Design a binder for this molecule. Sequence first.
Ligand SMILES: Nc1ncnc2c1ncn2[C@@H]1O[C@H](COP(=O)(O)OP(=O)(O)OP(=O)(O)O)[C@@H](O)[C@H]1O
Ligand SMILES: Nc1ncnc2c1ncn2[C@@H]1O[C@H](COP(=O)(O)OP(=O)(O)OP(=O)(O)O)[C@@H](O)[C@H]1O
Lengths: 735, 735
Amino acid sequence: FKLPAEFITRPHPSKDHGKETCTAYIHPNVLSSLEINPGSFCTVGKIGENGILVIARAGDEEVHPVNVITLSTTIRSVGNLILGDRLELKKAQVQPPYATKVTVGSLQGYNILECMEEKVIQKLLDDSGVIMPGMIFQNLKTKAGDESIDVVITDASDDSLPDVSQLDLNMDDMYGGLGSTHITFSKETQANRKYNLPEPLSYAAVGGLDKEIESLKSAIEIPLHQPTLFSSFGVSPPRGILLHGPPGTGKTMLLRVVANTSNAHVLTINGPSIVSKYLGETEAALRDIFNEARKYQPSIIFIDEIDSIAPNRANDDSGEVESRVVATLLTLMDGMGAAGKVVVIAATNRPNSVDPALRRPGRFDQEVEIGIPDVDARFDILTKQFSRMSSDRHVLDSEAIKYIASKTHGYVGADLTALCRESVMKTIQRGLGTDANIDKFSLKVTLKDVESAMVDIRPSAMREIFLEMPKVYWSDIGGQEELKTKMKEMIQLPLEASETFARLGISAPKGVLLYGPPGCSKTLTAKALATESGINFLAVKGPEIFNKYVGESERAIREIFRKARSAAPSIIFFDEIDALSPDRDGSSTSAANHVLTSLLNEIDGVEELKGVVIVAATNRPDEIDAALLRPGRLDRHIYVGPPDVNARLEILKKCTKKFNTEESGVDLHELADRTEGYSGAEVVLLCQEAGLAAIMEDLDVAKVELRHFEKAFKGIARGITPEMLSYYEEFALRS
Amino acid sequence: FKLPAEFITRPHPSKDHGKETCTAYIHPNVLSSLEINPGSFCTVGKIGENGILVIARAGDEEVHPVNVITLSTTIRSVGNLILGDRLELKKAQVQPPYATKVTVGSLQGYNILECMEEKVIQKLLDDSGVIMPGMIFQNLKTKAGDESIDVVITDASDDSLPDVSQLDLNMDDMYGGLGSTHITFSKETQANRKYNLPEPLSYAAVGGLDKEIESLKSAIEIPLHQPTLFSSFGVSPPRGILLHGPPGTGKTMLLRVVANTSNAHVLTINGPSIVSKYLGETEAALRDIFNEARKYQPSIIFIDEIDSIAPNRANDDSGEVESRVVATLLTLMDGMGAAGKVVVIAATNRPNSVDPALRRPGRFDQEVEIGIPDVDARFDILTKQFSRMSSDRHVLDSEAIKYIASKTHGYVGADLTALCRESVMKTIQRGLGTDANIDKFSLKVTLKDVESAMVDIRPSAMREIFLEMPKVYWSDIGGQEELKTKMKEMIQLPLEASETFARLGISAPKGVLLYGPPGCSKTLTAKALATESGINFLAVKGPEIFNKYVGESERAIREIFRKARSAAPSIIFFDEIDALSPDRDGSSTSAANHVLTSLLNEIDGVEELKGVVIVAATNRPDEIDAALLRPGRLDRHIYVGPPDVNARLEILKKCTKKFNTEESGVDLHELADRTEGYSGAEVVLLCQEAGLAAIMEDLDVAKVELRHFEKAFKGIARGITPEMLSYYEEFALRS
Ligand SMILES: Nc1ncnc2c1ncn2[C@@H]1O[C@H](COP(=O)(O)OP(=O)(O)OP(=O)(O)O)[C@@H](O)[C@H]1O
Ligand SMILES: Nc1ncnc2c1ncn2[C@@H]1O[C@H](COP(=O)(O)OP(=O)(O)OP(=O)(O)O)[C@@H](O)[C@H]1O
């Protein structure tokens, strides 16, 4: 009459040996209600995934409640069963025919154990069950050496009639005390891909964000193992961790890894699936799920799509479910206990849509930022996935990996998986079309397939609120020695002299203004400084912050400034400030005025900042208002205009690297002498049509002639009159 | 007590012989629930299709699940029973009266078997059941000569008293070992239209989109037939395929043909019919159907009208049916398994209504897009439609079909079927009203009826995003030789110099500007490019993109840009920019500014487009954005002014082909010299008005008179002024 509906997996206590494979502690009332012999096989429905983990069953001692059961540590580890997943119970399966090979695998080991074997097979098949997808057994004590070792029995040659039963449990039959079928020791293979078991994600599988990953691991590890120190402190641990960022970064992988690696209680929710039309039933279900959550002392609660389940009160009062469930959740979330052990983490797509009451300092004062992967993160992801499918399928040098990673600038791990999948699919289809069903191993993976995948992938993440501009070394950029010394000085002052600035009292001017021709000295200088400094740098455009909605630009500027503070002491930079700055001559809407006032308050409004230094670049000198041109802010000015000879030589030799200089015969000096009146963008375009004039003559060319350079020099006018030079000079002298 | 409602169909396994006609695996409880003899006939409700498929029934072995049923591949083929349709149970009907003919048809072959017949009557009539619409049996082994044949028993002359049953099942009676009347083998007729049984759609039913249907078949067959290679790769092969295009292109028949071309299980939905007033009922049904589809390895999932089921999250937050179903379906789609053998098919008319999060590259990056068929595809579909009922019903020359296809430019396959139906009904009514119920075989189908139906169809809205201009070749366009050289160089550079650009790093300027009079050389050039280059051509009109709705134009621009990018690297042309460029004057709305900044960011902003080429045509270059024309981008400029003497002479020669030049006596050069200030548009206009004046004198004429030409010329002003030419020249000087 009990009619059980859901079951929860539980750890096996007391260790020892016991059954260890077929514990199955279910109350006898459930067994009687299912008209199934207790001394027979059991089932693990776990919602779908046919095979149902046919394992033998036993009985409890009236000490395990019907709501929670156990299904053996090794079985749940092999099946990737998280501790506390939803479970059902159905009719058992018929007996298997026989077992064929049962071959050891020796996972995470180099094998060659010789005397350390001491008849492993006796312990392997001395226990009932032993399912073929694997079995993890601790080493316990094995002569001198201690240590630990794992075994894998995936490889076999047993065929079962029902194709749906992918688990196809195998029986055990050995003769011994304390002849098999053609021995058991045969090579040290890992889990086979013929059955394609679900690979359990490990620590090495995730990475690329070690700075945040280690912090999250510590923040979830120190309360779950050492609560006595926090209780003695009296401040109580924070019970909530908030995760947010661009979609596709894979925030669920971290929680999945820390759930499958840890042996504590793990439960997950589908979001609004529990929520129904009724209110009392949903409230009762919530109380029941939290009751089952905290009834076990070690537990971790995972919530998905908090923004959807907790809509903002002010944003939209749509109806149905609203902020009263949010309030009751907050009330029950403020009072678990003084010490406590249950820790709940939160992952959301966007933070603004989430109710600000949720992320109060008393509950979520720690913030985890998961941004778009950087170049190093892309290196790590490519390397880890290459190591994941090994070099057997294909081999590729590190040069191609670094080139394809340098091509990627705003790509994400989801995008990288899309590229690899499309490359594999294109390789398969090309092989089928051309080679007429040739062996797939020989075809492998080549660079042109990856290039084609890059061409036709068309990712849906072209618009990003945060831009990670690719980094370039100092060789590409050609600058001036005084300019380089100044840039290095103003990037080394706030990061090294901050310790002595306390006793000095000067701190930093924190004001940098950049003005010059639009040809160059606007983005490459920032790229070089970011590359050399090694600090996190973000790029934001002028028109990008502007939006049709009134107040949207204010939220964007406030949130990017908040990210600037949250991303450690670094350097912030604006691509073009000549849009919001004009307010009187350029008229414009009041949104520009509000943004200007907000940024003025943020930089010099009854506050002070020692970590971040604002850098502004403008196209015109006179477009800035008099409010910005005030002593104490942006006092320093850099000419960064018509650079001297050595910068031109550097940029010309960088652009001429592809071409041959010795064969041309030019000394690379007269070109710079005649080009001294040009700018970077027009120099780049000029060398472009010079190459074009070289190429269309007789198609492919590896040599460029002087006549082509002479023709291209007069093709484009200088486009520069000394009016702007005089204006820049008169703007410089008045400062 | 269980009260079953709906059943499912499954193939009979183990092959062999068994029964092959009346398996009907039914559990004993259902047998007792029908209060009828188990050794008697049963029925298949199949939600309609009166007759209810009266077939004999038997029992299962308690292993076969009660929910599903098996009713033999012959009956599935005869009744078009898709693998997974709803099924209903009902009491048996009246006993079969008698059998009359049972004659073999032997379709898809030339018949004339004789030698290897070996008494087919024995095999056909030794099986219990045998329903008269037809028996489909595999060849198995027939002496030496392997291969396979198909037999159809659609022809018969038996009538049953109840007209509700359209199947009128019969019995078998024969004498032999290892009596009917008038033998069995007779004639070679195809499927009879008297009963008009539904026919199974095949690959030959759809044509003209071979490159699309083959790609779809591959994308549904390699991931399903051989998942072992993908499992070995371990790249999580995609499970879903998206079908998109304009309404009426005929995607539903593609889904039906791919569903019935394979014996695997298929799920079919009826749109929002699954939605119920209970919030939990919908999600419960979704998880139930997902689980039942997953626990059978061979399965295909069909999604119809995802736009209605899944609306935009950020656009329509109506309530109840919201993104919660999207979240739960994504959760189900995430981790059902590793290898799998199930694929999902999703089709919708409007990709815009699809939620942006649902359009992601992580595991749904692959796209299958079908557009408006061209003249070749239309001709192929028309000739296939004619061949469907062959020359017996109607006769038409291939030139008539080609002319009809040429006339059809923007039509769709649904419109083509409407044209065919209109022609048929117009012919029927005309023959009836003309000859007082004469036989329909005399009139047949003529080109006049097709033309009348084409005139009377009156298409509602022939507006699309992929405009298909009429094909125009080289001789139809007259222009200067310099422009021809420039266009040849511009089309030759990308395709035959991409490798050189990659080696040199120059890439391409990807900027083409066309400024000139709006008469000619603006759309005629695009029409010429549409055919002479051989590359896919796209034309977007300025007034067309503008609309009353705010933001719809932006969405259309985004959609067309991503479609052009994803389709293939090709030259894209935009017709007229005068409706959006003048934003600095007249107080233009913010939408135009957003469009301009979006195109500026997507053309040359933190990314490059090495495949496609940006081509823009303008009338007034002074109204373009100041921040749009900069050195290094869109640098190429074409004068493309008024046509010269040669171009005007070519236009006159092309337009004069209708009349006779010898009779008129004009040299086709003096008129061009006199008409020097007229661009191509008003040149063809004056030619048309001269022809009008020529034909108003004595109706049809064979030549144009000089007096008529001079009267037409003197009645229309030149419309040109030296000031605009001087302005164009001085603007070209600065470029
Ligand atoms: N670090 C990574 N390594 C490998 N693949 C990754 C990584 N991060 C993301 N992916 C790929 O992106 C896909 C989607 O990522 P995932 O579902 O974990 O992200 P999410 O942001 O939590 O999800 P959602 O898009 O539903 O919000 C994964 O299935 C995987 O293919
Ligand atoms: N290519 C074609 N060849 C022949 N008949 C066609 C073709 N395209 C459409 N038709 C006709 O038009 C009808 C409409 O097509 P159907 O009902 O299959 O919808 P669909 O076009 O796939 O759907 P939707 O309107 O959602 O795009 C077909 O039943 C058929 O009679």
